[PDB]
A = this chain, B = another copy of it.
């Protein structure tokens, strides 16, 4: 292995410069199966890597795990191995009333409610997505025909207090995050997730291209629990979009 965590060599990639980066290790195979000649490379901790082919060109699929810290490890080590373009796909909870479950969201930039992004750039630096990657995702969503929303995402280091959840062990939220959801809502923020602030900041400040797409599985203004059947269809919809976007970026 040429790297500390992923368990991969330069030869394993076979000249790949683009990677799709989901959060769940168990979802890596499903994405790679949509492309040609899928093969397993490695699995260590939360990092599972598969290789595939797209229009005769090698492509990587690699899981990051939950959160900025493990995402920062995966992105750095993939960059060392030659990756220059990163496309993230994940699940999300919407905070706007007009956004429904099953909708697809493309992130232009993120609210930095994380710690890892500060290790690459000061807070004043924008957590902005690459223009070519964002274009490819919006065009891919229109190609397959989905309800799409484009805008700002709130990216939090926690699932609970940072997203103003009160049904917890303590039942309390620290002063800084008290009434924060209502503030983001008024500012036009679409949704909550946990990795995009880190990914977009670290790529934009290091000459790497990054894009972000997500499927809505819950709306915070309507309900609190997701549905099992609709989630699988929504995940399938978002996967098709990210693969189609990767096609345009090769």
Interface residues of A (CB under 8 A from B): 4-5, 23-26, 44-46, 65-70, 72-73, 76, 79-80, 108-116, 118-129, 131, 134-135, 138, 150-152, 156-162, 168-170, 172, 174-177, 179, 183, 186-188, 194, 204-207
Least CB distance from A181 to B in Å reads 12
Q: Which residues of B contact A168 (CB under 8 A)?
A: 76, 80
A174-B45 contact, Cβ under 8 Å, with A69-B194, A76-B169, A157-B69: no
Q: Which residue of chain B has the shortest Cβ distance to A67 in the bound complex?
A: B69
Q: Which 5 pairs between the two chains have the least Cβ-Cβ distance?
A: A115-B115, A67-B69, A109-B126, A109-B128, A46-B46
Q: Can you list 11 A-B contacts with CB-CB less than 8 angstroms, sorted by A residue number?
A: A24-B45, A66-B73, A69-B157, A69-B194, A73-B159, A76-B169, A116-B158, A118-B157, A120-B174, A170-B186, A170-B206
Q: Which residue of chain B has the shortest Cβ distance to A24 in the bound complex?
A: B45
Least CB distance from A63 to B in Å reads 9
State whether B183 touches A175 (Cβ < 8 A): yes
Q: Which residues of B contact A157 (CB under 8 A)?
A: 68-69, 72, 114-116, 118-119
What's the Cα separation between A44 and B27 when bound, in Å?
11
A122-B176 contact, Cβ under 8 Å, with A80-B169, A150-B131: yes
Least CB distance from A20 to B in Å reads 17
Least CB distance from A180 to B in Å reads 8
Q: Which residue of chain B has the shortest Cβ distance to A113 in the bound complex?
A: B124
A110-B126 contact, Cβ under 8 Å, with A158-B72, A168-B76, A204-B152: yes
A169-B79 contact, Cβ under 8 Å, with A108-B131, A109-B128: yes
Q: Which residues of B contact A79 (CB under 8 A)?
A: 169
Q: Which of A26, A125, A131 gathers the greatest number of chain B CB atoms within 10 Å?
A: A125
What's the Cα separation between A120 and B179 when bound, in Å?
15
State whether A161 touches B120 (Cβ < 8 A): yes
Known: A68-B115, A131-B138. 5 other contacts (CB 8 A): A80-B168, A109-B109, A113-B124, A126-B126, A174-B183
State whether B80 touches A187 (Cβ < 8 A): no
Q: Which residue of chain B has the shortest Cβ distance to A198 in the bound complex?
A: B157
Q: Which residue of chain B has the shortest Cβ distance to A82 in the bound complex?
A: B169
State whether B65 touches A65 (Cβ < 8 A): yes
Q: Which residues of B contact A176 (CB under 8 A)?
A: 118-119, 122
